[PDB]
Amino acid sequence: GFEFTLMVVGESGLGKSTLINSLFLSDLYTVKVETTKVLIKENGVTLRLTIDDTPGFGDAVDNSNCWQAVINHIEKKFEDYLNAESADNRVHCCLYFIAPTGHGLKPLDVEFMKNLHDKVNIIPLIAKADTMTPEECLRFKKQIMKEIHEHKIQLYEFPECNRKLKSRVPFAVVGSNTVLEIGGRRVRGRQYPWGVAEVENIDHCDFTVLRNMLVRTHMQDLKDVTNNVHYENYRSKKLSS
Amino acid sequence: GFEFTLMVVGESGLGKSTLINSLFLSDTVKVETTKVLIKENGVTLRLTIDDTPGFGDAVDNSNCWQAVINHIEKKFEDYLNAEADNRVHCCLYFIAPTGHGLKPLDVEFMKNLHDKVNIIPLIAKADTMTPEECLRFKKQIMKEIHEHKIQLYEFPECKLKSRVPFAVVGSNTVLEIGGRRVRGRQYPWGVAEVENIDHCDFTVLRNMLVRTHMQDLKDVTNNVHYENYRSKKL
Amino acid sequence: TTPLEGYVGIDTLTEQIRKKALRQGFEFNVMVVGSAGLGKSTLVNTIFKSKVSRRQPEEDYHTPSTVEIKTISHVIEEKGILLKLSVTDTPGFGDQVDNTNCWQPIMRHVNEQYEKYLNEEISIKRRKRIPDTRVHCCIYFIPPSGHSLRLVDIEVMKRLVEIVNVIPVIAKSDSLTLEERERFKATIQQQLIEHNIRVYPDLENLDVDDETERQRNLKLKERLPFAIVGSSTTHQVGSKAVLGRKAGWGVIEVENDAHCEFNHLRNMIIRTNLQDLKEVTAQVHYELYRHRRLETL
Amino acid sequence: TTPLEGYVGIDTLTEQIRKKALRQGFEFNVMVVGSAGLGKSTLVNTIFKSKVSRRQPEEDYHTPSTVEIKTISHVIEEKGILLKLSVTDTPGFGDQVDNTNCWQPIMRHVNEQYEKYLNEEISIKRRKRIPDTRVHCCIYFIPPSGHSLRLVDIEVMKRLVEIVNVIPVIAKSDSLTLEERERFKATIQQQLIEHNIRVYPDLENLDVDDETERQRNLKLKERLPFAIVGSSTTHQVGSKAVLGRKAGWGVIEVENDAHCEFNHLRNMIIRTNLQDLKEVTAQVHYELYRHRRLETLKK
Numbered sequence A: 001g002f003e004f005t006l007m008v009v010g011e012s013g014l015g016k017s018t019l020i021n022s023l024f025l026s027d028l029y030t031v032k033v034e035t036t037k038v039l040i041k042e043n044g045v046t047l048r049l050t051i052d053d054t055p056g057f058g059d060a061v062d063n064s065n066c067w068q069a070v071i072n073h074i075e076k077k078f079e080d081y082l083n084a085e086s087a088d089n090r091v092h093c094c095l096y097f098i099a100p101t102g103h104g105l106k107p108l109d110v111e112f113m114k115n116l117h118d119k120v121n122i123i124p125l126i127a128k129a130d131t132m133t134p135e136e137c138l139r140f141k142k143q144i145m146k147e148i149h150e151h152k153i154q155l156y157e158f159p160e161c162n163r164k165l166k167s168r169v170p171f172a173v174v175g176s177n178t179v180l181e182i183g184g185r186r187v188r189g190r191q192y193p194w195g196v197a198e199v200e201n202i203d204h205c206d207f208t209v210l211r212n213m214l215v216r217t218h219m220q221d222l223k224d225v226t227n228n229v230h231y232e233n234y235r236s237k238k239l240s241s
Numbered sequence B: 001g002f003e004f005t006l007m008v009v010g011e012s013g014l015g016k017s018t019l020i021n022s023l024f025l026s027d028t029v030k031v032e033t034t035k036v037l038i039k040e041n042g043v044t045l046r047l048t049i050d051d052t053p054g055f056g057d058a059v060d061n062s063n064c065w066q067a068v069i070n071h072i073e074k075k076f077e078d079y080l081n082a083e084a085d086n087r088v089h090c091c092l093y094f095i096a097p098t099g100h101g102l103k104p105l106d107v108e109f110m111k112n113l114h115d116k117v118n119i120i121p122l123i124a125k126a127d128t129m130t131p132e133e134c135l136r137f138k139k140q141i142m143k144e145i146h147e148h149k150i151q152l153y154e155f156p157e158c159k160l161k162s163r164v165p166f167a168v169v170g171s172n173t174v175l176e177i178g179g180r181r182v183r184g185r186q187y188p189w190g191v192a193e194v195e196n197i198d199h200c201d202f203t204v205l206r207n208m209l210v211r212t213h214m215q216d217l218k219d220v221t222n223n224v225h226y227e228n229y230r231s232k233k234l
Numbered sequence C: 001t002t003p004l005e006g007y008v009g010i011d012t013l014t015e016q017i018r019k020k021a022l023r024q025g026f027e028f029n030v031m032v033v034g035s036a037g038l039g040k041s042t043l044v045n046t047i048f049k050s051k052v053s054r055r056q057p058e059e060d061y062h063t064p065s066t067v068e069i070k071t072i073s074h075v076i077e078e079k080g081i082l083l084k085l086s087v088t089d090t091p092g093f094g095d096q097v098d099n100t101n102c103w104q105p106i107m108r109h110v111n112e113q114y115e116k117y118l119n120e121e122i123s124i125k126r127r128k129r130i131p132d133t134r135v136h137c138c139i140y141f142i143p144p145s146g147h148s149l150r151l152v153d154i155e156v157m158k159r160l161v162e163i164v165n166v167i168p169v170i171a172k173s174d175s176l177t178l179e180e181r182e183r184f185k186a187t188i189q190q191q192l193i194e195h196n197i198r199v200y201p202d203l204e205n206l207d208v209d210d211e212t213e214r215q216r217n218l219k220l221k222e223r224l225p226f227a228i229v230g231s232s233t234t235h236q237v238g239s240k241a242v243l244g245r246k247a248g249w250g251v252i253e254v255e256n257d258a259h260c261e262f263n264h265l266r267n268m269i270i271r272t273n274l275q276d277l278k279e280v281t282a283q284v285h286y287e288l289y290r291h292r293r294l295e296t297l
Numbered sequence D: 001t002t003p004l005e006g007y008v009g010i011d012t013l014t015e016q017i018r019k020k021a022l023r024q025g026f027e028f029n030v031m032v033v034g035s036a037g038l039g040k041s042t043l044v045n046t047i048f049k050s051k052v053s054r055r056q057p058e059e060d061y062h063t064p065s066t067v068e069i070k071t072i073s074h075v076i077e078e079k080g081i082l083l084k085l086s087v088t089d090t091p092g093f094g095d096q097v098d099n100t101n102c103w104q105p106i107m108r109h110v111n112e113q114y115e116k117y118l119n120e121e122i123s124i125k126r127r128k129r130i131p132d133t134r135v136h137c138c139i140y141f142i143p144p145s146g147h148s149l150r151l152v153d154i155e156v157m158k159r160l161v162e163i164v165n166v167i168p169v170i171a172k173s174d175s176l177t178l179e180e181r182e183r184f185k186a187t188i189q190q191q192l193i194e195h196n197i198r199v200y201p202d203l204e205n206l207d208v209d210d211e212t213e214r215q216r217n218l219k220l221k222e223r224l225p226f227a228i229v230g231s232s233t234t235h236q237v238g239s240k241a242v243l244g245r246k247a248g249w250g251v252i253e254v255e256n257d258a259h260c261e262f263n264h265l266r267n268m269i270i271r272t273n274l275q276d277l278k279e280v281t282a283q284v285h286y287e288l289y290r291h292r293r294l295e296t297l298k299k
């Protein structure tokens, strides 16, 4: 089988659980870290998948130093692997959900991505893209990228295989679990009195891009960069110190 | 000829001058005396008219009627020393047409002066009142005069006595109405006639004062008011 | 200044205000000042076309030995609008032998209403809506002498105009011919200018910018003092049932502009300058009373 | 009541008041409170149908280090009625890492306006007409989480329902299906009952002798919180131009009741309860502030 660890970080009510169900087509569903193990048997290859949710993130009045729990979790996994050297449970991917506000990064997001960008691969997703018009989505993406480049945050750059799809970072995702009948078509989407927002539509949200890149096109490069960059650096101080 | 004197007392602005000119058809409180010779109907009348100016005009009218009394006493003293009839024979008091009753100043004047000069109460500006209002005002005035025990001058022989106090309208202007020349007052709603018995009581007053019952005023002055002063003096 | 792009709905505000007055009603206070037998009760009954005066004009009256102040209150219904009407009469005024300092009770009454309003306003446990008992109008009755104002009239008007809205009227104007009416009005106006008596409306209490409302008040000022006639008995003239007085020579109609100026007075009080009278009372006279007391205390 | 025997003219009185208003203009003070990026400026521009927000939605926004309170003033004219409108916004509310004392500047602003009014009132040399800077309406924006209210929202609403009128609205309601909106509304209302957050219109402030107003305001409260959508862009749908938002699957209509609830909010703010908001501000909130402050300034 194959092993993978995906962490979900974001404020509550941003479609985190719905997106996780949508990607993996399964009923998978004080800031600590909650672990859920699933065994997904699809496309022949069986994946033993781990989801590390961080519930309570950003739900408090004072959010100072609320990112220490995820740092502790990543470093604990690092130490467990280092001891076992003498199963890869290291957190390979981290999906960060940014609220669809339309102005830029909040200070909390900046702090999380400034103190976690040299621990885990950060994939920023704009949560709930079905509440923005395309122009707003592009403006928000540009502002987020400008602020990321201003604060010197090193995100995860996807490798060569979709050229216009991998340049869509940060991804704007829409998740749904209900199957609707549009003209005899079974489609996953959300039904509003004004129309049906479809999850798999390429013009509506970047769900298909993320599903392809993460689930079945680049799930091994994440592990490789985790082993050769983040874990190597972590050993480069603890052994040195 | 025949000597007589009339003293006019009342508040300023009540048609006293107009009423005097209508009755005799000729054009500090200190009594002002004027002398006129009227050769009406062939009989020469030497009329002395004594107006009281400033009566009821100032804010303080306390004992403003003393000048009137001092005037009558002085004339009485002059006659007694001589013993020309300069004694004040008639006095006309004008009551403002308020429609309620007698004012305190009216009551005080008629209390102090009703034993020194003959007083004929007149409701000045009688056109101010509808006939019912005038009748009610007359009834109330007579009731209050009887309550204060005020004795006015009653008229002998010559229905017309029941109209006391007389409601009079004075006007020096003759106008043409219905193809007749009448003395009256002109208003957009009509003309109030001076010589109409149904409109006011001017004709009764003229008949009593001039035509018929004037020597009676002289007699009641000599035999009542002059005797009492001399009796007190003696 | 800021252009709009559609129907926001601000224009509805007026209607809203109406629905909030409809439940509470408005309140007006009139004070009639003059000597006895000048038609004050009849005039108040004629203005409001109801038996509103304290004393019905046909009952009785005896002159009090002192100047007294008496007040009656009524609720008047007019097409859904409630008016809490206070009528304040002054029996015994200007009718005594000695009239020195006969303006004291009137000024005392007005200052008492100002005191009540001020003491409720400064009070820490204040009510949401302070009932306004302040004298909003003061109709001053001048007898139809035809010569000049009385000295007792000049004194009282001179004292009153400094603290109260004073509207001079010529009582029982049906006793005056038109020529006499004009001479009397001219002499009264000249005496007002001579003794510096400023009667309502006063143009110093109006905005400089406004002109279309300044001219109207100037016309009203030039027409003062009004020649009024009051009645409550309906007579049949021609084919019309009209309010008026039936003398022995004609029917004097109250509502006829060719006969008396009652329409001007009633339009100024009720239909055109009611709220202006209330506003000038609250903002010119009440404020000057307030500044004097607070400096004293 | 005393019966009338004719026409007097008290009915004209309303018109007289109306005329006076034309020379002064009515003062209205709105304050929008919520996290940055919830549509406060857009909703202010949608309610008044003009560019009346301090910052237009296009311009760049940076979160300040501290919670600031910014005000803008405008004059809006309609059919002879002038509205002097002061819109006050809260840049930096609920956006910092540490949101403690985020409601302090808001309450400081409201109390400072009350203080200005009371100081102008108590002074010997008083103006004829006191300018009114008091906040008449406060619109609170609830992010469309779909689960429950945030802790900061509960705290600030509890502090604010005591000194100013608060009208809750679900910001960006376009992101919730009808079932989700219904469930979110039920949760929000149960939470408001549980924390005893009594929002405008408070039926305790309405007279008992009036029943139609009581029932109407009961319906308005039963509708709260409002699911609102704000937008200053019009789009052609069918054969009519409608204000709305355009996404790949349709257009959200601001003026359609079957799409959002902007109609109810704008009707209450402008057309049905504006004067009620002003009266409650000047007779329930300012009165209580005046009582409390004078009971301390007795001497």
Ligand SMILES: Nc1nc2c(ncn2[C@@H]2O[C@H](COP(=O)(O)OP(=O)(O)O)[C@@H](O)[C@H]2O)c(=O)[nH]1
Residues within 6 Å of the ligand: A011, A012, A013, A014, A015, A016, A017, A018, A019, A128, A129, A130, A131, A173, A174, A175, A176, D145, D146, D147, D175, D176, D180
């Ligand atoms: N607008 C929008 N709403 C969503 C989306 N996905 C989920 N939701 C709704 O958001 C609400 C809460 O999100 P939930 O899926 O429970 O995930 P959470 O982020 O873990 O709370 C639910 O009502 C979801 O149905 C989305 O893509 N767009």
Ligand SMILES: Nc1nc2c(ncn2[C@@H]2O[C@H](COP(=O)(O)OP(=O)(O)O)[C@@H](O)[C@H]2O)c(=O)[nH]1
Residues within 6 Å of the ligand: B011, B012, B013, B014, B015, B016, B017, B018, B019, B124, B125, B126, B127, B128, B168, B169, B170, B171, B185, C145, C146, C147, C175, C176, C180
């Ligand atoms: N209504 C009415 N007015 C009168 C009458 N007589 C005079 N007047 C007017 O009242 C005013 C005062 O008249 P006047 O005789 O000068 O009063 P006096 O000062 O008392 O002498 C004048 O303008 C007269 O025209 C009358 O009988 N009825």
Ligand SMILES: Nc1nc2c(ncn2[C@@H]2O[C@H](COP(=O)(O)OP(=O)(O)O)[C@@H](O)[C@H]2O)c(=O)[nH]1
Residues within 6 Å of the ligand: B098, B099, B100, B128, B129, B133, C035, C036, C037, C038, C039, C040, C041, C042, C043, C056, C057, C058, C061, C171, C172, C173, C174, C175, C228, C229, C230, C231
């Ligand atoms: N000439 C005249 N008389 C009037 C007028 N109004 C009332 N009266 C009469 O004046 C008398 C008393 O008036 P009243 O109303 O009692 O005056 P008040 O005592 O000052 O209140 C009544 O008989 C009325 O008929 C008017 O306008 N002109």
Ligand SMILES: Nc1nc2c(ncn2[C@@H]2O[C@H](COP(=O)(O)OP(=O)(O)O)[C@@H](O)[C@H]2O)c(=O)[nH]1
Residues within 6 Å of the ligand: A101, A102, A103, A131, A132, A136, D035, D036, D037, D038, D039, D040, D041, D042, D043, D056, D057, D058, D061, D171, D172, D173, D174, D175, D228, D229, D230, D231, D245
């Ligand atoms: N989905 C949605 N987006 C909106 C709405 N109103 C405004 N926006 C968008 O949200 C972004 C931020 O809005 P803005 O009014 O600037 O937010 P503020 O900072 O809270 O005033 C803008 O790009 C708007 O286009 C709305 O009702 N629904």
